[PDB]
Write a protein that binds this ligand. Structure first.
Ligand SMILES: *C(=O)/C=C/c1ccc(O)cc1
Length: 125
């Protein structure tokens, strides 16, 4: 395992050192998005939660293509305000229900330490 707790205050500094292989050792799902919502990184734990194959969703748009259930003011709306503002740090519960059994999760969205990238972290509840 990589030992990093979900919700940790300095998580963006810790994850700045990991490559795709290290990200697969986290105890929670991790997605890195660009400012348009395209998927740059997608770890093994996220694929275990949602059924998606990580290598197949990299490059797709999360809000348009992969996760239309998140295209709502409650999820995408928060993301886009964060990108526009250049700051984002929010945690909320959500249900993922597209082409899968409805699954309740906790989501943490946080701006990355690098400029135009954003993390989405997911764990079951
Ligand atoms: C709603 O459409 C949610 C879909 C979804 C969430 C998270 C993922 O990693 C993949 C699909």
């Amino acid at each position: 395992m990589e030992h990093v707790a979900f919700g940790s205050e300095d998580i963006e500094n810790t994850l700045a050192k990991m490559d795709d292989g290290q990200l697969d050792g986290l105890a929670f799902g991790a997605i890195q998005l660009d400012g348009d919502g395209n998927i740059l990184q997608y770890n093994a734990a996220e694929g275990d939660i949602t059924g998606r194959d990580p290598k197949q969703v990299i490059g797709k748009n999360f809000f348009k293509d992969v996760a239309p259930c998140t295209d709502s003011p409650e999820f995408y709306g928060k993301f886009k305000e964060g990108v526009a503002s250049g700051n984002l740090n929010t945690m909320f519960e959500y249900t993922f229900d597209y082409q899968m059994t409805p699954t309740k999760v906790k989501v943490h969205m946080k701006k990355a330490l690098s400029g135009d990238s954003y993390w989405v972290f997911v764990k079951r509840v």
